[PDB]
Every structure is written in structure tokens, then in C-alpha cells.
Amino acid sequence: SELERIDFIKESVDSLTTWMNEERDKRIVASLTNDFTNYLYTQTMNVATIRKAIF
Amino acid sequence: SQQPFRPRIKAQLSGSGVSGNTDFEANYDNLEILSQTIYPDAFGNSLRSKIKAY
Amino acid sequence: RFYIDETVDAGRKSLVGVDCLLGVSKARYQSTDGVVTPYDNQDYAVIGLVSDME
Amino acid sequence: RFYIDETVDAGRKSLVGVDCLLGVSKARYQSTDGVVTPYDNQDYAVIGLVSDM
Amino acid sequence: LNNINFNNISNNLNLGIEVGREIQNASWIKSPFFSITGTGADRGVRLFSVA
């Protein structure tokens, strides 16, 4: 660690923080996207479909 | 700051210089440096003790 | 929460860890009795938007 | 370096380790450019002495 | 003997590499989910702070 001048605690903490952020957000997204009871399909995303979804 | 170390030697100057009024540029002497790279090596050994009571 | 142990391999190595306890669910409420309503097994506030990738 | 760990087995055993970074090399220098010298790729201060045993 | 030497300065054995102590990461990225989140009831992602 001292040879390759890597402060391991610091670098590991900030990379693990980034990982924790991404994984919590992925929990949120996975639960949000699992098993749509109500959805719209379209070939291409257009404002017609967004308006239809708000309606 | 232990890193792969590189010790260097300089060879002995073995040219004739200049005589009398001749100026140094008529015989410049060549400084020659030789090198070597020494990479570190990690090694160790350990001893495990018994229970404190023993 | 962070857990830092500098005592791995007799103190020669170090372990950093990060942990979280979180309940995450899509809001989807079930009937607390046997009555079936429009809210029974539905995403309470989610509509999907599916399209093709490029 | 010495590593003392008095926390083996819930702190009931202990482990003493010793570790070292060491660079060992028979002095054998190379030319830092294309100038060939007598010191080039030769044992700097070692002459072997081989015998039967 | 004395030909054209086409090596570059990396072959020079008089140079030592100096490694940098600052290590760049990809931690610049952010997702728009922390802003959606909150403790109020008018949040896409409601947090119930259950002590």
C-alpha cells in the first residue's frame, strides 16, 4: 500500500460510498419497475404518449 | 519512500586531455553513467501463540 | 454505516465495509379484509412507459 | 516491521508477524545508452571461485 | 558502431518514474433520485423515518 502510494482507507471509503449510492438507487428503480399493473407501450417516445400517460 | 531503486556508477575518465595552449574543446572527455534497477521484494513470517492462560 | 478494520492479517491488511438496512417497496396496498376494490393489487402511483431501444 | 495482533480468538490468542521489503541485487550495471564499456553487463565486484567438493 | 539511435526518452535509464498521489474517480455522476426522495407526503419516493 505504501509502495504504490495508495491511501487505502480513503480511496476505499469513497468508492464504497459511490457503490452504496448506486445500489440504493437500484433498489428504488427495481422496485419501481417491477410488475407494472398499468402501462403504455409505444414504438417511439413522443409527446403524444406522454400526454396520454398524464391523461 | 521505498520504491524500485536505481543506483548509478560513472566510469573512470580515460582520455588524454589537452597539452599546453590547446583548448579543452579539442579533446572533450566523455562522462559515462551505468545503471541498475533494484526492485523490492516482500517477505515475512509469523508466529501464532496459545491461549493467554497457557 | 461504515466499518473499518485495520487488524486484518495481524494488522498487515485492512478491510473497509459499508452496510445499509432499508425497506424498499413499490406502493401497492392490499385489502385488510376480503373485500376487493380497484386499489387491491395495483401500483398506487406508477404507470409504465415502454418503447423500443433506438 | 513487526505486526502484533492481540485480538486473535476474541483477543485470547495473539499473532506476531514480521514483514520486510528488501531489494537484493548483485551489482551488475548496464549502460544507460549505447556506449559499450568494460562495466557493461558484468559482475561489478565479484569473481567466482568454483571447486570440487 | 555509431548509427542513428531511434530510441525515445523512455529508454533513458537515468530517469525515474514519479507516480501521482491523487487518483481520479468516476464519482462525478449523479442520478436524479435523491431529489425525488423526501419525508413529505408529496414525494415520488416517500421516506418513513421509523425509529
How far CA C43 is from CA of C15, C47, E35, in Å, comes to 41, 8, 21
Coil, strand or helix at D45: coil
Q: Considering CB atoms only, which of E19, E26, E33 is closest to A28?
A: E33
State how far the Cα of C48 lies from the Cα of D52, in Å rounded to an integer.
87
Minimal C-alpha gap between E27 and chain A (Å): 6
Length of chain A: 55
Query: Resolution of the coordinates in A?
Result: 2.7
User: Grid coordinates standing for B37?
Assistant: 534497477
Which positions in chain A touch C51 (Cβ < 8 Å)?
Answer: 41-45, 49
CB-count exposure of residue A4 (10 Å: 0-12, 13-18, 19+) = exposed
Using the Cβ of D35 and the Cβ atoms of chain E, whether some distance falls under 8 Å is answered with no
Q: How was this structure determined?
A: cryo-EM
In the numeric block, the cell 543506483 is attached to: B7
- From the list E21, A43, E14, B42, the residue with the least C-alpha distance to D17 is B42
CA angle (B38, B39, B44) in 5-degree steps: 125
Alpha helices in chain C (DSSP H): none
List, in sequence order, every residue forming a beta bridge with D31; answer none if it has no partner.
Answer: B34
CB-count exposure of residue C23 (10 Å: 0-12, 13-18, 19+) = exposed
Q: Considering CB atoms only, which of A11, A15, A28 is closest to E45?
A: A28
- From the list A12, D31, B4, the residue with the least C-alpha distance to E14 is D31
Half-sphere exposure at residue B42, Cβ-oriented, CA atoms within 13 angstroms: 9
How far CA D26 is from CA of A18, B2, E14, E18, in Å, comes to 47, 19, 19, 25
The DSSP element (H or E) to which C48 belongs, if any, is strand C48-50
Which positions in chain C touch A40 (Cβ < 8 Å)?
Answer: 47-50
State how far the Cα of E32 lies from the Cα of E46, in Å rounded to an integer.
15
Which positions in chain A touch C43 (Cβ < 8 Å)?
Answer: 35-38
Minimal Cα distance from E5: which residue of D?
D34
- From the list C41, C14, C47, C12, the residue with the least C-alpha distance to C28 is C41
State how far the Cα of E5 lies from the Cα of E14, in Å rounded to an integer.
17
Interface probe, candidates C3, C4, C21, C24, chain A, greatest A C-beta count within 10 A: C24
